[PDB]
């Protein structure tokens, strides 16, 4: 997963979960990447699928 093309003002709402380093399951890549940007690059990908 690459978040360099973020942030984005909007995300589609399909469900394809990713597990972040904050133990939060992110609903999709766009949601995860916007959170990474919002964390100023501190959040990282733990693994694919639900946490």
């Amino acid at each position: 997963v690459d978040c360099s093309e973020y942030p984005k003002p909007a995300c589609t709402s399909e469900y394809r979960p990713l597990c972040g380093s904050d133990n939060k399951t992110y609903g999709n890549k766009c949601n995860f990447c916007n959170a990474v940007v919002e964390s100023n690059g501190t959040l990282t990908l733990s693994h694919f699928g639900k946490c």
Binding site: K8, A10, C11, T12, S13, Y15, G27
Partner: protein, 185 residues
């Protein structure tokens, strides 16, 4: 199965928009970004109950898709959860609307603008969207936006979430009904 219920493709989960029909042929509408690249759809995560196969997909530019039912026994309710839907209508600024999705359930709000352009990036730009102050979260894509017994739109996407509040854009259902020659029932 009815509007708002979960639907699974080989890739992920979306929500069923509205059950529609043409003559004696039954289909269901959902988001184009969900039908894009999907062939078969199932009713459960186990992929044991088949629903049907993608018959059309339009995304980006628009955001709608249609799936032809191949499952002959599953009930195909012309409702949204328990809400009967009897017709389709055009959104208007100030209209009170309700959305149902497989992740967040039912949330209400109002239409705040029409003909909005949403850039999901990478060339995925959708036009002519209904803007609202209703929230939506991953899994809610394709779910219905209705107003009383009137079908209004299909969930496309937006920002924010249901806890803090958000902005969600919807594809006008009238356009999809017209493109495929189908009608709600």
């Amino acid at each position: 199965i009815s509007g708002g219920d979960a639907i699974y493709s080989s890739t992920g989960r979306c929500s069923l928009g509205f059950n529609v029909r043409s003559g004696s042929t039954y289909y269901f509408l959902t988001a184009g970004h969900c039908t894009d690249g999907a062939t078969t759809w199932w009713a459960n995560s186990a992929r044991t109950t088949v629903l049907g196969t993608t018959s059309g997909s339009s995304f980006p530019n628009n955001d709608y898709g249609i799936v032809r039912y191949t499952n002959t026994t599953i009930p195909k309710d012309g409702t949204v959860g328990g809400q009967d839907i009897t017709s389709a209508a055009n959104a208007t600024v100030g209209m009170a609307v309700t959305r149902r999705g497989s992740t967040t359930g039912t949330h209400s709000g109002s239409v705040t603008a029409l003909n909005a352009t949403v850039n999901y990036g990478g060339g995925d730009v959708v036009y002519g969207m209904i803007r609202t102050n209703v929230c939506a979260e991953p899994g809610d894509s394709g779910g219905p936006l209705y107003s009383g017994t009137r079908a209004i739109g299909l969930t496309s996407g937006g920002s924010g979430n249901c806890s803090s509040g958000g902005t969600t854009f919807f594809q006008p259902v009238t356009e999809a009904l017209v493109a495929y020659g189908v009608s709600v029932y």
